Every structure is written in structure tokens, then in C-alpha cells.
Amino acid sequence: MKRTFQPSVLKRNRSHGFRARMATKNGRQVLARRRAKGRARLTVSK
Amino acid sequence: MIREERLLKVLRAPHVSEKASTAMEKSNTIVLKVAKDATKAEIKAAVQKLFEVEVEVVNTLVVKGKVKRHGQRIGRRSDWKKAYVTLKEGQNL
Amino acid sequence: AVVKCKPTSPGRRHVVKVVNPELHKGKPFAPLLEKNSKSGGRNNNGRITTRHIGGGHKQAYRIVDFKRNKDGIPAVVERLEYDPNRSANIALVLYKDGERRYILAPKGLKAGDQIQSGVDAAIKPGNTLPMRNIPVGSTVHNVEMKPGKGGQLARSAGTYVQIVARDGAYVTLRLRSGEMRKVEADCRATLGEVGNAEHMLRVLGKAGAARWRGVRPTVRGKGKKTRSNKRTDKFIVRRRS
RNA sequence: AGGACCGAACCGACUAAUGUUGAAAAAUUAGCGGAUGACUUGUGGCUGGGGGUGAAAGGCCAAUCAAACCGGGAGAUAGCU
RNA sequence: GCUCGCCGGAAGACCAAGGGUUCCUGUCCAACGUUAAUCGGGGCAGGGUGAGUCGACCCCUAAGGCGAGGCCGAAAGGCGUAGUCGAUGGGAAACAGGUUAAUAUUCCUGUACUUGGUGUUACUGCGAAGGGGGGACGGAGAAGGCUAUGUUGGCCGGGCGACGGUUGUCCCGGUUUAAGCGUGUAGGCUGGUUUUCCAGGCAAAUCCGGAAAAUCAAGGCUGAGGCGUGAUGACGAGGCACUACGGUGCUGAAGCAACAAAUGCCCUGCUUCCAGGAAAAGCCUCUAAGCAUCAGGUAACAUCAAAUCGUACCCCAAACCGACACAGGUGGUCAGGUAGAGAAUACCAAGGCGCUUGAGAGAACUCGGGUGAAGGAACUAGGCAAAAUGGUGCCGUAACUUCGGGAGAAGGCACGCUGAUAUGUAGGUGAGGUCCCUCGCGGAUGGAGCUGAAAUCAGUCGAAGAUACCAGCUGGCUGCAACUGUUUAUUAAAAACACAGCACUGUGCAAACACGAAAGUGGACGUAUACGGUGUGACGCCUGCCCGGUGCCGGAAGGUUAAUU
Prior knowledge:
The structure is cut from a larger assembly and holds chains A (46 residues), B (93 residues) and C (241 residues).
Chain A: H1 9-15, H2 18-23, H3 25-37
Chain B: H1 6-10, E1 11-14, H2 18-27, E2 29-34, H3 40-50, E3 57-63, E4 80-86
Antiparallel strand pairs in B: 1-2, 2-4, 3-4
Chain C: E1 2-4, E2 16-18, E3 33-34, E4 61-62, E5 75-81, E6 90-95, E7 100-104, E8 114-115, E9 128-130, E10 139-141, E11 161-162, E12 170-172, E13 180-184, E14 188-191, H1 207-211, E15 236-238
Antiparallel strand pairs in C: 1-2, 3-4, 5-6, 5-8, 6-7, 9-14, 10-11, 10-14, 12-13, 13-15
Chain C binds 2 RNA strands through β3 and α1.
């Protein structure tokens, strides 16, 4: 049976990309808190 | 009109391999490892004004780095561009 | 003209087809095709607001002029076209000056007929002139509510409005719904009546007829009037009966 | 032409069996329906949770739903183990 | 290296998403492989991806996103103009052969082709964020031609058979060749040429469109394929000389005729149809300001450049998603032979594999199958599971019915091979030649060779002639539902859902309703033959009486009533 995860770089980078996240203020706060925590990879590494 | 120092710095060093030797003995081709950008015009100018030989066509390709993980330590190689230069007139090394 | 297809199989066992041979066959006037295709019945937000709508076969939009600002320029009708957007058909009128525009085809309009607008046009079906020059007691179609728009009333198939009296600057009408309304006499009107009025004869045969027209099935889940405008009470005389 | 029949790919598994600490946190064995349209699918966008969507099962919204996940109120309260 | 077996509309080959070096060489067996592991998709070192002609990239675009001004909202924030992003579509160009352990339409021999700049030759009206052409479009059907491909005949080179015959109507392998150029055929489309005028194409226009006249009716557009060049070229079995036994150089002839034929092309066409079936850029013509010896445009000439990014590997799986080297899922293209209605089924061509534990034992019992004397649902809640027919053409085929259907109703007739009709029949495919002939991608002719069913008679084999796989069991009564379809993914696929039709009710356009504190949007770029909500559900006979109460409509002598003063 077809599974839930269907890989797609376009979909991933359009739904959770850096620019898309930073477009809205909420994603800006998400990035700020992730930077404060110290995550090596903020969103995705294309 | 390609400026100076840029031509000297564009190319890194020649590459030695069995395929390179076969190309040299077949079509007198030279295989070089060059900088990241390494535009075709820059490579042409550097070869013309450094090896004082004529170049027919310049072909370039990008070689992806490998992985040499030493155990829980993923260290990937750097990136470099391989360029094939055809002279058709220079019987040099 | 209605043809009863033989009951070969259910689903088109009881269909009724409304065919009309004189209607033009072929592609429409390409220079007059534009956007506003099937919208899907979704607002800007994206939620359902007109439930039981959606889908439907792709349909192009043809620009149709109702203002009829072209006055004193006779035009010749060349052919009749079927517009999927509206039940009524349209007529391709070529003006003597070279304009090719669309207009609702009345019942009495056939191929090769002369139509002229303005305040000097003859009183025959298909002409358009201000209602101030419309004799009282003559049925009308494509009635206009305010000048400059063109035919905001009686645009559906087989819709007519009978003029009862003028009574001063305004004019009193009687809409097909059965209500009398007062309208500005300066509004433009079109003589004659709209074209083919055989819309109820067709029964759509089967589910697909309604399904591909853009109508979704209605799922099962009285006398409470909801009219509250309080601005057009003076304009309107009495409600429908 | 036929929301036609017989019938391939394709489409949900209806039927007896296997499996019930499996190969699989839902498949296979052999029959069964549609298979020119209310059909199916690839690629992009929208409908964000007291809301969405729903040919209506109170189904689905990430292997979960008569109200999804994350951090906080919050070491909620508990005449109960 | 050989034998046996499987897939061979895949278990084969090529692509995009997917993973990112797992691909090749040298080396090791601790773990990783459900077992030993010299092996490998495991560890270390090295190598590999060559583009103006692939694609991306890039000019403008659909759905949709962002959004300068501006509107709204206590702010975050919501819609939205010009504008800008956004393929899943549209725009310029390439193939034969060879090569490496691994890459090719990228490298090598050739034919070639598109775009832009530079300077010259001769000519001249050039110049848009504008107009016009087309770009530019739906479901279904078909005939007529052609191509890949397959078959047959001749030809080329080699053979006389481990065992009865095999110098012949015998066997073996081949009988392949691109883009471009000129021809413009089969087919389809269009009626053209000349002159005058015009309330239009936002102002104007030689361009489009409209109105007048003269003339021809033969002119134009599109258009697969075949033809000669391409190509005295490449390939070519098989042979002749040098081998590190992996290989190297040279030679090399036929390479032609007939038939079948596609889902591929002619065809973005033809006929029908209602459900009426996108926009923009690319290209061509004219005009706004401007320039009108200038600058620019036109055809040719020589030259320059077409930057940047991936080109390995699997792509119906061991490499992606499922925690796995998992009996699962994954879009597009290539589509041979035998018989057959076919892309199902049975065996084969090239290609890939025997699926990561094996050998014995031949017990009960479990799972999937083969036959079984007599009975044939008698067991079981239950014809559940099983068992049987299963196709072709012909004869025949009831009640009812909306006259479509029931129906393939039920039930019977023959199915192999060989000879004759007919050494292979009708049909089709179809060479030369006569006559003329624009005289050749011309027509009346007339038969070469090939498919050969279908139909009748006769002979013969076996118990069975659709003898393989594949392949409806059959009728009646009866409740339910108009039929087809849709959900309870994962206990109930229906007697539940909707469904085409019908009835009531509200909506006069800034419509009702809904999403929203609000701009705004759907309704609808629609206008009472339309839309929203409710109930039933084709079709035939009807929906009859009743207004107590509850919701609804029209409101009135009158009793009651807040804010407010």
C-alpha cells in the first residue's frame, strides 16, 4: 500500500523552506528560537 | 580582456590518470583541475597566455566529493572542476 | 423542437433533447474569448459558501454587450451561437461600420435581419430605444434597472415583462415573478422577447447531465421571509403573489 | 452515441482459506464489479482543528479523531490504586 | 565452459521525481549478508560524469502566491491595483559508425542546422507597454496511403551430417544504412486579382474589418511518404598476417524483389455531438513622439560567440517510500516469432535470473493440489467451500414489457488431417508491354509471384478433434430498491447515501445566503424557464378530511411593557 511519506524536494522546500518560513512572522520566531537552542540545521540543507 | 592574476589563479594543477594518459596519446588532450567558477573563457585565456599554445575547444565538468567517514565522523571531500583542453597543434607534455 | 430519444437503456431512457438546427455549428469568434472560466464556487478564503457546487465541464466566456451605446448604426445578423454561460442564445450582429459584437437573440430574430438602436428605430422586435419612447402595453425583454448597465431584468430564456403604465417620470412594470416595480424611464430597453423558451422541456436524462454542468449532489440534512432592505421600498410597489 | 454488454492494464477489496508474536502494524491464493466516463492518474496551488472537508460513515486531517501534533498554564485536581 | 529450468506488455531496455557516489580497478574478512563468505550495494587507496544541437537555464503565461500606492482592523494582521513570482503546457537547432574496466546525440571521420554581434557590398521609410493573422486547444467513429517491424523469393560465404536419406523445392548467418538538400505526390484547406471610399480596431494607420465597382474562375496554403544526393562513404559474416591469450593491422561480396502491418505519421484533418471545449510569448504588416544625407531595415559576404548547471549508478527495486538486502506501492516510452479476436493465456528471439541457509528421513499432524467404486447436499444455521459447462457459425428461443429488452433465454447441429471442386476458389496485393502523353512523384490496358478463409463431396486416425492454457452452470417463485455508482481505510459495501424527475418556500440585483469584527469574495462577470433551503425519488391510479397546540404568514377595538423625559 502507498505510504504516507512521498519524498519531494519541491514540496519540502515550498512548505518548510527558509524563505517560506521567514515570509510569515511566526516562522521568524521559529527560526529565532531554533537559533537560540543551537540547531545545526535550521530547516533543510538542499 | 580577461585581466591578469585571474588567469594565473583560475587553474589549480594538471591531473594524472590512465584516462588522462590515453586522452593525451589519442587526441593530445590535457586534463586539469581548476577553481570552482573556472569559466570557459577564463580557462581559454589562461591556457593561451600561460602555455603559449592554441586551444581548439575547452570542455569542463564538476567532480562531486566523496565520503571518507572514519567512524561516527562524516567528513566529505571538497569540490573541484575538471577541464579537458584540446590543442591540436602543440606537441608538448 | 424536442426529440424523445428511444429508451435504449436507463440513463437516457427518458431524456429529452432540445435541438435547433439553425444554430451555427463550429468554433465561435475567437477574438472574443477570455478568462472567467469555471471558478469552482470557492471564495478568496477558500471555504464552502455556495454548497452543492463545483466541478463541471470547461466552458469559455463570451463578452456580450447590453448597453447598446451604438445608436444610428444599423447592423446585420449573420448567425446564432449557443452560449454555455447563459441559457438564452446570442446573435452575431455585424455593424455597418465593421463592429462584430454579441447580443441576446430574441424569438423573432433569424439570420439576415437588420437591427438598429437609438431614439429613431422602428417599433419592431429586436430594436432598442429608451423606454421613454416605448408605447405602453408592449412586452419587453432585457429590461434595464438603471441607465448605463444594460438589461439587468429578464435575461433568462423565455422571460418577458409587460408594461402597464408610466405614471409620471418613472414607469411601472410587471415582472414575470408577478410584482410591479417603478423604474427610471430613461433606462434603455430592447423590443421583442428573448429567444428559445423551451428550457423546461429538457429533463437532463441522467445524473451526468447535471454532474458535468457544474452541479454537485444535494445531501439531505419554510415561509420565513428574509427580505430586509428598507431602501427600495419606494421603488417597489407590491411583492409577488 | 450508448453513465451497454463480454473482456486486458488500471481501480476499493466483496466472498472461503493462509497468516493472528506474518513477508506485510491489512498482503497472497481462487472466484466476483467497473473498464468511454458520476472513470482513473502524474505534476503545482487552495480549503488549518469548536475548524476544514465529507454522493453522510459523526468518516478522514500523517499507522490516532465523539474534536490532530508541539511548548506553556501544569508538579491542573483527585473524598481512587 | 556445458547441461536443465523461469520471466521474456517482464523477473528485459531507456527516461523524470526519488537516494547522492552505492559505478570501475587494487586490497581485508572483525561486524554488516538471517548460514562458511576469497564474494558484494561492507572497510581502505585510486579513477570515472567532456554539450549552441539532451534537458535544465532563460522571454512572456494558467491555477495559485507576494505586493509599491490604497481600504479595513485596538497592533500582529485581512483583501487588493500597477507590478512580480509561479509548469503540470507553449519558444532555436544532430545523426551513422567507433572508442574506455567505468562516460556519449558530450570524444573521434562526415554531412549538417538555429540564434546574436562585428565590418563591407547595393537598395530603402525606420521606429510601440497598440491594432490585425495564427499561435489557440472538447468527447466519439471511420475509411485511404505510408513507416518501423515481421514473413517469403533470389543472391552472397560455409556445409554433405556421431544413426535410417540428405548435391537439394536441403541447412546455417546476412540481405542494415541517419539529419539535411531539390522534387511537393497521396490527402486536406481556401475562391483569387485590380481600383475607389469608410461614424470601427482608445488618437492615427498602406494592416484587419466594412461599402462600391472591372476581371479570372485557375491561383494560393498545408501536406506523410518515395525518389537522386547524403553514401565510389559506414557496417558486414567469413577470411589473411602479428599475440602479454586481454587482443592488434588488413581484406571483404551479396547487401536486391513480393506480401502482411501497426496504438506510429498524413490528422491541430473529415462526419456527428452537446457538456460548446484556456492566456501569453515566438513570427509577420502599419502606424504615437522621434529621426526623415543621420540613425535603422532589407539579401549576400568574412569573422566572433551561444555563458552557467546534472550527464556514473537502481528506477515495476537489494539503491525511492514501508524501522529490514521486506511475498507491498511507484509516472512516461520501446512492444519480435509461433496459433489465436487481442497489450489476457501456452512455448521461444536479444536481454535478465534459479530468488542468501543445505543434505538426509519419507511418521502422526498442518498447508496447496491429483484420482477415487455406490449414493449426490443426505453433513453444515447456510450449494459456504468445492464440483460441472465454458468458443465458433447455423436452427430454435416462452410469460411480461416503457416495445429498448427479457436472450448468449431454454434446447440441438459440425469442429482433427489429407485429396477434389480449386497442382491455392471469390477478394486483395498487384511488374512489363500497346496508345497517347503537360512527356512523368501521368492515365483505359494485363498478368507474373504471395495471403488464402468460407462452402460441398470423398478418404483416414483415436474413446474423446474448443482435445493445451484461457473459457457463463442452468430456470422458476418471491421481499427490497428506478437503473449505474458512493462511505463505515482496519467487525456491518446494503434493505444506508445520493442519483435523473417532482412538490413547497425565499431571493428585484449593492438580490437571499455563506466565508468574515472589515475591506473583500462565492452566488454571478448569472438576472424568476436563474439561484438558496426543505421533503420524496423513474413510470401508471390518487396525495382525501381536520388549524387544538407548536413554527410561519397578513395585524387589530383592545390588557401588559424597557430604554427615554
